[PDB]
Amino acid sequence: DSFVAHFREAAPYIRQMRGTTLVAGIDGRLLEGGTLNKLAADIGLLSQLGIRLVLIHGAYHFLDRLAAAQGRTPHYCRGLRVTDETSLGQAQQFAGTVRSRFEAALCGSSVPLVSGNFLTARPIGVIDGTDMEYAGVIRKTDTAALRFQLDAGNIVWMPPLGHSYGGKTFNLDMVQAAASVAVSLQAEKLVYLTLSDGISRPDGTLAETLSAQEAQSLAEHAASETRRLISSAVAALEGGVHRVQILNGAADGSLLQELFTRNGIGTSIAKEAFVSIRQAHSGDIPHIAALIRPLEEQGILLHRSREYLENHISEFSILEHDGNLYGCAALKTFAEADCGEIACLAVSPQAQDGGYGERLLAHIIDKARGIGISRLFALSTNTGEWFAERGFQTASEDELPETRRKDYRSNGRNSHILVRRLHR
Amino acid sequence: DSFVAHFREAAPYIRQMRGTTLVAGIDGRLLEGGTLNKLAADIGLLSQLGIRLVLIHGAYHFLDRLAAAQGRTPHYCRGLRVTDETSLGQAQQFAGTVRSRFEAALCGSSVPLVSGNFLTARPIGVIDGTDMEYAGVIRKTDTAALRFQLDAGNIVWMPPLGHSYGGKTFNLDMVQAAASVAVSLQAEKLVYLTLSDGISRPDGTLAETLSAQEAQSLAEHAASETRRLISSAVAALEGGVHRVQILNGAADGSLLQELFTRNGIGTSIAKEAFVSIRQAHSGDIPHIAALIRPLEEQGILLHRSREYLENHISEFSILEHDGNLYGCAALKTFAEADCGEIACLAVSPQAQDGGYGERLLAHIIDKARGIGISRLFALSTNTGEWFAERGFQTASEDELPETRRKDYRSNGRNSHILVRRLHR
Amino acid sequence: DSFVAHFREAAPYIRQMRGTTLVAGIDGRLLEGGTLNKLAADIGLLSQLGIRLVLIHGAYHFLDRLAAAQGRTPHYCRGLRVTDETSLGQAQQFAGTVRSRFEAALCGSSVPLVSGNFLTARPIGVIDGTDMEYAGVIRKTDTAALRFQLDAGNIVWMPPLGHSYGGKTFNLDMVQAAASVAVSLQAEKLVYLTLSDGISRPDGTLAETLSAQEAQSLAEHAASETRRLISSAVAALEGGVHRVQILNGAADGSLLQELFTRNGIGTSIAKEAFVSIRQAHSGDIPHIAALIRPLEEQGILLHRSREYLENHISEFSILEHDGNLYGCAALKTFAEADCGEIACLAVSPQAQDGGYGERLLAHIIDKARGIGISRLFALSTNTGEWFAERGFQTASEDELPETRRKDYRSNGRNSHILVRRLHR
Amino acid sequence: DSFVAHFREAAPYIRQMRGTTLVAGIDGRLLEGGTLNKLAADIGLLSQLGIRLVLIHGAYHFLDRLAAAQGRTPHYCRGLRVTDETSLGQAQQFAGTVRSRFEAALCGSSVPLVSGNFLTARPIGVIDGTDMEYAGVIRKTDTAALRFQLDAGNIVWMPPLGHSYGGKTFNLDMVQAAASVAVSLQAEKLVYLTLSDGISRPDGTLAETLSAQEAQSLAEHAASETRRLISSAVAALEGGVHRVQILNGAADGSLLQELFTRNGIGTSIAKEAFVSIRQAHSGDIPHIAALIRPLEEQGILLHRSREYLENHISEFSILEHDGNLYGCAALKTFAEADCGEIACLAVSPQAQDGGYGERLLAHIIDKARGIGISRLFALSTNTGEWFAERGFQTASEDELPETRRKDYRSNGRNSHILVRRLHR
Ligand SMILES: CC(=O)SCCNC(=O)CCNC(=O)[C@@H](O)C(C)(C)COP(=O)(O)OP(=O)(O)OC[C@H]1O[C@@H](n2cnc3c(N)ncnc32)[C@H](O)[C@@H]1OP(=O)(O)O
Ligand SMILES: CC(=O)SCCNC(=O)CCNC(=O)[C@@H](O)C(C)(C)COP(=O)(O)OP(=O)(O)OC[C@H]1O[C@@H](n2cnc3c(N)ncnc32)[C@H](O)[C@@H]1OP(=O)(O)O
Ligand SMILES: CC(=O)SCCNC(=O)CCNC(=O)[C@@H](O)C(C)(C)COP(=O)(O)OP(=O)(O)OC[C@H]1O[C@@H](n2cnc3c(N)ncnc32)[C@H](O)[C@@H]1OP(=O)(O)O
Ligand SMILES: CC(=O)SCCNC(=O)CCNC(=O)[C@@H](O)C(C)(C)COP(=O)(O)OP(=O)(O)OC[C@H]1O[C@@H](n2cnc3c(N)ncnc32)[C@H](O)[C@@H]1OP(=O)(O)O
């Protein structure tokens, strides 16, 4: 399209991303090519948009491309890399050349860029018999100092090197280090810039959007490298990071396409919290009753009787935690096979505003879908916009299933009626 | 001595140094030896004492120790270094290894250390026919960003590398770069840590304390390397830096001995501002008269007559600028050859508090010294402590030269009498 | 030694002390002598080093030296002082002269010094029949206002006087007031400057370092004055203050020697928290098992069997709280009587980072010492530096007790071996 | 009146006083009586109203009431006080008792009150032969530290004591010290709380409102004590203080009545800047012409001709500085003896907004008054509210002097007409 249409398309994601923190793990290959000026520029822009940036790069591949040309062969283990003194020394060289060239590339074509001693490392030690020598993992990250630079508006640049209190230096694994830094900062987003296009499924298809479970279950059959991504992306989510993303850093302007279109072009991973939602039974009736009574009493929910719940308990879903129930929601069916109706949606006032509402609606929508329903009605007297704001369009008596149009007239509430269309 | 005596000796310099900025130019040799853990520790301490630190290191010697072992020979010019692409690339390697090892050394045996893209460079260009290729000099230093890190309490670490807006990188001369950064920050002190003990004089003697003139005149006969120090130290002073210092970074704990003892152990350089102080003549009498009248009229200065100034004008010194006079001061002599007396010391109220007072006293003391006087009296009614605070001890009528003891009794002012001893 | 050696010796304590708060209770005798210029200077320095200072002085002795010369005799009670209106009035005089002279002494030989109405007092009331009249104790300290002055870098000076909301003034006991102010500020250190050298033991020996228990048990046989110190020093520790210290304010530069040498020269008191550490029994095995399993499973701890723990349960120590166990650690012995080995050291992840690790190592070291062991080995695969950092030096297969060298080869883990020497 | 009417009366002065600084010099007698609780309360309130308070008290009278009861007699000189060591020591006692009791009184019947070492003193030295011993005057006030406490909302309390850098203490004269502190802070108001009702005139009348000149000329015949007030109040004004005030601190709630009523009850002093305003002559015509032309050209001022100014130059006043003119203003008279008219009022755009406008109107009003005019008209097309806002009420053609009503109709401008009444 036109410039304007594209700019307006990006606007909502610009809104979201603003004043948010984003930790980028970057493959060290991308710091050498012509792939460098391009992505320095894209990072520049990210800065220009009020995004707080932390950047970490790896060095494994450079190290190896020096081992190879040297006669030496690299040993990895549990996926990590045995780093001797000489190659630890070469990684400090590499970090100096990559940071300086990223800087030059960042300056010409003035964004404040900063670096410091934020990471303290300790040696991974020995694994399965094998000494990881100078392979480190992060022991203690200085979260305050970093916030402080990011507060100032500075982009933070981190090499894959931590220091120990014995005055030693340890090579860090970029992929797990970026995950750990993101967890410390509670970053809204962790972005891994790799050399592939996201993460594939069994047969060839690039996985757009994945839950942590689904990612988890891809890994059973996936190549070891992408196995390590997912495991680090899973641990990050579990640690607090709202969203992790895998892209191809080599594919021109991929970074921008991911962040600022509904599409994206790589893979995106997110963890739903635990939300036991189960089909109700006669045991739950006093609980639903207690929850729902005061809302009836206030005119928010249609009067009911215990008889109705006894005889209708199979259209009810409940949301529980540690036994106790915090929500419920019903689905009514009708003579018309295309229609459903979500009713008696409620959540404890004390567990309100945490997404329980949304999870119950989702659950009933999947329940409705799974039985052929393509039009979900909601009839509400004081909560219409909650539904309006979640895909429900305004409707009318005459659009309702015949019998419901009946009960609507004779119940007297003059509630607002809404429908949402559900597809294949 | 004991710990306590040493700690109390350091206290006054600790007072001075606190919250003050200090830019250290460091020879890159000192970043490799066992000379590294030692001086990381001393810099640590400096930090611990509330000193704002900027650190810059050179790379010339490392570069050369790579040219030599390569077959290549290094060309310098007007004292600077022709840096080709390959050696520019090696200086980025060097900076990564030196910053990482200084860090490790700084961490073990936690001080906040920071680095960023504060320098923009431009190529020195061509000199006397010779292309300096990638030899840069600083074009624009980001003074705000630096203050901001130093305000936070961070030690700033700078490599000898600036970036251009064409996305190129230029090797910087440490010695002149540290001078330029210090000038930008208006640092109170610029410290060059070298491999010699300060700067020698003609015959062998280490020059403790030098004015910029005196340094300037040593350089006519001095080795080119120390010639370049002095020229950069001179330009720094002229630019605002209150004090520049040359030490031996290799000599264990030299840094600490310089800053925190009256002694020091290297050389220290400072510029007096311009202070035309000349022997008065009959032309100045109305000016002195005008200056001095209102103070007489107030009881601060002994009454006088124009006759006295006419006939006594040769014991008077005046301080001038752009013709106009801002101060004067007399020296009286007596039958006793060991005695003098500073009198009629005065400075315009509008040029007060800038050191003019002090310069006039100094000048009369040199005048007194040069004629064999070893005891300078001052007789003041409302300004005793100005003299007390500058080496004058309390005295009495009976200590005065006989005739002055006479005039003292019969002038009636009951001014306080002070003396200062002056030696060989 | 030399200046440099002394300065480097002080550096680590300078590091510690920086930005830390220190409340000094000062005997009012020390505010009169030649002991005043000396310790104003030392306090000056303390300021110069970034230490936040609160200062409180007493007046009892001055009051008494006025009662005596007056005919009057002073009555104390439960160790405190009955202050009538007239002597309350004289303590306000004393505070004005002592604050003014401390100031003058502080200014000449410029540190920001501040004072205000931070203390509200209430009357101690009546004790054992006796009216303490104008003897107050602190009712409410304005902790915010004080932090605020200390944040500004000001030294706070407090007289032993609080005000009541009835508009009355109450004399405060310096020793207990300094303890209360320190508790409010949660100061890292409380320092009492007295006229003796610390606190003695039964027979003559100056007690260098004491736990609160040990101090507590000295007091059963100690002179009443030092009894009151310890009781106030104990309550301070219990209240949060990390460390309280008793010195001789009269002994020149004692203050500096305490803070900045390993030695010190007075007495120092600290409270260990509660840390039930007991010899394990067959009941603890499932708990240790549960703790230790997942670490085995991860390769951090040597595989074991329940049989081993059943038959080896006597070399195990466990750390408990409210029944539940949070840590364990074993000591192995060998045919060589000089050798031991700490093994199976572990702490719950949820109670990690609170010093439990350290307490278990300490406990096993005392256990090893008490049975003649002078060389403690530790064999760790992924936790060597935890031991390196706590007095363990690197070792080798050949240094191990013969049998352990055996098991080491044939267990296959290629863990790192460390030893620590333990003396008499 | 009623509470409401009084509160509304105070409101406008509350507006003015808010966030403004007020330095109070307080006679030390007022710190002892029942006059203490009363004025602590009134100062309290002042604080409660957002007024930044600095308070300084004297001690002379207490000192003397100790000299008298001792046999000793006090010597003053040029109005100041010879303070020996013993009485310097007693003033430190006095300051401790007065600050403590003011505090108690301030607390009961919680306002933050602060004190520190803001003053450095130097000895007045010797005057007219006489040694002022420990009589000091302020050498350097720490203006930053004080602003900083006042910024925090703290009331600052200062004793009449400064310290020297020789570690000595000097008694300060409250009256001149408060003037010097006020000048440093550029305080909006300096308030001297004495034991009389303001400053009298020749015959008995309390002087309400005085210019610095008028105060100056009262002093030729005034008692020495009030002579010293005026001289210190004059120097303060000249130094920047907008307004100094003399009250009776003993008269209950005088402080409040001064600040918050149009009345006041003591005396108030203010300095007009220099404002050469002189009757114009034929020399000024080109200058007025140049000033006034562009405003005519814009429709702001009635067209004129040079002829009119030539023949009418005697009704013109001009405001000059260094020769150059910055303003002018005319007064027209009419057949009606009660009428005047201010016209052709103008000020250079470059000297606008500094009160020149106001000074010209004032000058013409005095000119009009002095010739019997009781109704000043102003006819303006684009500047009515400037006049509305300065005592002019709206009027109409028919209210104008007959001839002016004529010229008004036939000039065509439909300017707005305003009048101001002027009385005896
Ligand atoms: C068809 C029907 O069943 S009609 C009956 C609907 N149920 C009721 O009205 C019961 C009373 N209300 C509730 O119980 C509400 O908590 C629910 C069920 C609507 C939503 O529960 P939650 O767990 O709080 O839902 P969820 O957390 O997903 O959404 C919370 C958001 O809904 C918004 N919301 C809550 N009530 C309303 C409302 N009455 N109108 C508009 N928005 C609302 C909240 O403000 C909150 O806003 P936010 O996104 O800006 O923070
Ligand atoms: C023996 C004799 O001639 S007696 C006559 C001495 N002359 C007079 O008293 C004339 C009146 N005073 C002056 O003219 C003063 O300016 C002088 C001549 C004493 C000093 O002139 P400056 O150029 O201001 O001297 P300089 O700048 O070196 O020192 C200024 C410092 O002196 C301090 N100083 C100035 N006057 C005095 C004083 N009367 N007492 C104590 N210290 C003083 C100022 O406070 C300033 O203090 P700082 O170091 O804290 O900022
Ligand atoms: C010989 C042997 O038994 S080998 C087996 C050692 N045990 C294990 O490795 C079990 C896994 N690790 C643990 O259980 C760790 O908690 C322990 C036992 C080593 C220490 O427990 P804690 O109660 O946390 O000890 P403590 O609180 O005294 O010390 C905590 C500090 O140790 C540091 N530390 C923890 N693990 C390590 C490690 N693997 N390497 C280096 N330092 C470490 C922590 O970072 C923390 O650092 P800090 O001082 O900068 O805050
Ligand atoms: C009857 C007659 O002579 S009509 C002709 C009046 N003269 C003109 O209009 C000439 C154009 N204006 C001027 O020359 C204006 O500067 C003057 C003469 C009105 C005032 O001159 P100043 O020296 O600026 O007067 P002064 O400093 O006492 O007052 C300045 C204030 O007047 C206010 N003021 C200035 N012009 C106007 C205006 N046109 N209307 C309302 N208020 C105004 C300014 O905003 C300023 O406001 P402040 O008090 O909020 O800061």
Side-chain angles (χ1 to χ4, degrees), chain B residues 25 31 35 38 91 100 146 198 201 212 286 376 382:
Chain B
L31 294 186
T35 56
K38 210 108 252 356
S100 180
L146 288 169
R201 312 178 101 82
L376 224 217
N382 311 279

Side-chain angles (χ1 to χ4, degrees), chain A residues 246-285:
Chain A
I246 330 303
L247 315 185
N248 179 346
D252 184 24
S254 67
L255 228 183
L256 272 28
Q257 275 207 320
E258 242 296 300
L259 307 163
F260 303 102
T261 68
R262 66 163 112 41
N263 307 294
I265 33 58
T267 305
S268 165
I269 313 200
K271 200 187 188 101
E272 174 160 23
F274 46 45
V275 180
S276 178
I277 301 200
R278 84 200 270 170
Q279 215 280 128
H281 55 63
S282 76
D284 308 308
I285 279 149

